[PDB]
C-alpha cells in the first residue's frame, strides 16, 4: 500500500516538474 | 600407594552427594549466565535496528528516484517533444543514472557472524563486545546441552 | 572454588580407577560417541527439514520470475513484428523495460524489508543452532580422539 | 525439459494476450 | 590434613620435574597433531582445485559465447543488412541473452568458512569432514600459541 | 595418561595454595589479561596493515573504472550531439556499450583466474589467522570471568 | 595473451557462421 | 569534492579525444 503511495506521487511530481521546466524555457 | 590416598581424599571432600549438588549448581549457573547475556543482546538488537532503518529508508528513496526519472522522461517524449528527438537524451540519462548508482556504491564502501563483525567494526561502539557475546552464547549452549543430558 | 576442586578430585579418582586404560577407555569412547550422535540426530533432521522448506520456496519463486520474463518477451515480439512496425513501438519497449526493472527492484525491496522487519519484531518479542553446532564440535573431537587412540 | 515447458508456453501466452489486447482497443 | 595429603601426593607423583618434561612433551605433541592434520589439507586442496577448474572453464565459455554473439550482430548490422531492420532483432537478441543467463543462474542453484561448508555440503565426498578439520586446526593453533608462551 | 592425572594434581595444588582466594585470583587474572593483550597487539597490527593494503587497491581500481566510464560517456555525447546525428551514431553507441560490458566481464574473469591459480600454486608449494582467533576468544572468556568475579 | 586468443577467434567464427547462414537462405 | 574532480575531467577528456579522432578521419 505504502509502495504505491511512494511511487505514484513521485511519478506525478516528476511529470509536473518537467512540465514547469519546459514552460520556463 | 596413592590409590588409597586419593580414596581417602574422595571420602573426605567429594562426599559423593555431589550429583544433586551438580544438578542445582548447573541450573543456577545457567540462570546467572542468561542474566549476564541479556545486556549484550539488547545492545545488539538496538544496533541492528538502527542499522536497518537506514537501509530501508535508502532503498525506498532509491525507488522514488527511479520513478521520478520515469515520469520526467515519459512527460517529455510524449507531450513536449517527439520520440526521435529525445531518443539520445533518454539513452544518456540512463547511462548517467547507472554511473551515479556506481558512484554511490563506491562512496558507501555464518552469515550472521559476518553481519555482526561488520556491524561492530562500523560501530566502534563500546558496551557491546562481539567476541564476548559469542563466547557467552557458546558457554550457555554447552551448559544447556549438558543439562538436557543430566535431566535425561 | 570448593566445588571446582571437588570435581577435579572426582575426575582424578575416575582416571586412576580405570583398568585397561588403553582398552576400556576406547570402549567407553565408542559408547559416548554413539550416544552423542543419537542425540544429534533430531537437530540435524530439524535443520534439513527447515532448509528444504526454505529452499523449494526460492526455487519456485525464481521459476515464476523466468516465466514472467518470457511472457513479456512474447508480448513485445508479437507487437513489434506482427501488429505494429518497430518505428512506432520503440518508446513502448523502452518504457516497459524500465517498468520491469523498477518492478524487480520493488520486489527485492519488499521482500528484504518484510523479512527483516518480521525478524526484528520476532527478536524483540522473544531449532537452536548454537547447541547443534556445539554438539558437532564435541562429537568431532570425540571421533578424532578415538581415531588417535585406535591407531 | 521442464525449462522449455516453462518458457515456451509463457512466450506464446504473451503473444496471444498482446494480440487480444490490441484487438480490444 | 587433606592439604598435607595432597602435599605428600604432590611430592609422590607430581615429581616437579614436569617443567622441562612439559616443554618436550608439547614440542612433540605439536608435531604429532600436524602430522595428523596433513591428509585433511590434501583432501581439501584437491577438492577445492577440482571445484575451481570447473568455474574457470565455465566463465571462459561464457565470454566466448558473449563475443560470438557480438560478432554476429556486428556483421549483420554493417554488412548484410541496414541498421533500420536490425534494431528490433538486436534488442530481442539482448533480451534473449539476458533470459538465458538468468536461466543458467537458476539452474546452477567466516566468509571462507561458509564457502568451505557449502562446498562440502554440495560435493559431500567421504574422506574429508570440515568439522574435524576445523577442530583440529583450532587445537593445533592453541598449542602453537602455548608453545610460544613457553619458549618466551 | 599418568602425566594427565599428574596435571590434574598440579591444578589441584595451585588451587589449594591460594591465599586471599578471590583477591589474589583476581590479581592473577588481571596479569593474564594484560599478558594476552600485549601478545595480541602484534597480530592486530599485521591484520590492520594487511586490510588497508588490500582496501586502497580496490578503492583506486573502482575510481579508475568510474573515470573511464565517464570518459566514454563524454566521448559519446560529443560525437552524438555536435559532430553527427543520432541516426548515424545509434549502432556505434550500442556496440561500444556492448564492448565495454564484455571488457569488464573479461577483466573480472581474468583477475579471478589469476588469483585462484596463484593461490592454489602457493598452497601446493607450501599472519596465522587462527591463532589470532583463538587469542581473541580466550582473552574474551578471561575478561568475562573477571567481570563475573568483580561483582 | 590467452584473452586475445579466446575473443578474436570467437568473433571471426561468428562472422563466418553468419555469412554462411545468410548464404543458406 | 574528489568525486567531481574525477568525473568532470574524464568527461571533458572524452569530448576532446572524440573531437581529435573525428578530426583525424
Ligand atoms: Ca532507435
UniProtKB/Swiss-Prot annotation, chains A, D, G, H:
Q: Which UniProt keywords apply?
A: Calcium, Calcium transport, Ion transport, Membrane, Mitochondrion, Mitochondrion inner membrane, Transit peptide, Transmembrane, Transmembrane helix, Transport
Where, subcellularly, is it found? Mitochondrion inner membrane
Where is the chain membrane-spanning? Answer: 1-25
One GO cellular component term, please give it. Answer: uniplex complex
Would I find Nuclease among this entry's keywords? Answer: no
Task: Please list the GO biological process terms of this entry.
Answer: calcium import into the mitochondrion; mitochondrial calcium ion homeostasis
Which Cys-Cys disulfides exist here?
Answer: none
Q: Which domain of life is it from?
A: Eukaryota
Question: What is the role of this chain?
Answer: Essential regulatory subunit of the mitochondrial calcium uniporter complex (uniplex), a complex that mediates calcium uptake into mitochondria. Required to bridge the calcium-sensing proteins MICU1 with the calcium-conducting subunit MCU. Acts by mediating activation of MCU and retention of MICU1 to the MCU pore, in order to ensure tight regulation of the uniplex complex and appropriate responses to intracellular calcium signaling.
Q: Which family does it belong to?
A: Belongs to the SMDT1/EMRE family.
Describe its partners and assembly state.
Component of the uniplex complex, composed of MCU, EMRE, MICU1 and MICU2 in a 4:4:1:1 stoichiometry.
Instruction: Write down what this protein is called.
Output: Essential MCU regulator, mitochondrial
Gene name of this polypeptide? EMRE
Q: Which residues of the full protein are shown?
A: 50 to 74 of 90
Curated annotation (Swiss-Prot), chains B, E:
Q: Which residues form a coiled coil?
A: 16-50
Q: Which residues hold Ca(2+)?
A: 87
The listed location of motif Selectivity filter is 83-93
Mitochondrial intermembrane topological domain: 71-79
Q: Where are the transmembrane segments?
A: 50-70, 80-101
Please state where this protein is localized.
Answer: Mitochondrion inner membrane
Where are the Mitochondrial matrix topological domains? 102-152
UniProt comment concerning the protein's domains: The selectivity filter, in which calcium ions are arranged in single file, is composed of two acidic rings separated by one helical turn along the central axis of the channel pore.
Q: Which family does it belong to?
A: Belongs to the MCU (TC 1.A.77) family.
The protein's job, in short, is: Channel-forming and calcium-conducting subunit of the mitochondrial inner membrane calcium uniporter complex (uniplex), which mediates calcium uptake into the mitochondrial matrix. MCU channel activity is regulated by the calcium-sensor subunits of the uniplex MICU1 and MICU2. Mitochondrial calcium homeostasis plays key roles in cellular physiology and regulates ATP production, cytoplasmic calcium signals and activation of cell death pathways.
Q: Assembly and partners? A: Homotetramer. Component of the uniplex complex, composed of MCU, EMRE, MICU1 and MICU2 in a 4:4:1:1 stoichiometry.
Task: Provide the protein name.
Answer: Calcium uniporter protein, mitochondrial
Which organism is this entry from? Answer: Tribolium castaneum
State start and end of the fragment within the whole protein.
184 to 342 of 367
Amino acid at each position: 500500500i505504502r509502495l504505491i503511495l511512494t511511487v505514484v506521487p513521485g511519478l506525478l511530481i516528476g511529470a509536473a516538474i518537467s512540465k514547469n521546466i519546459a514552460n520556463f524555457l
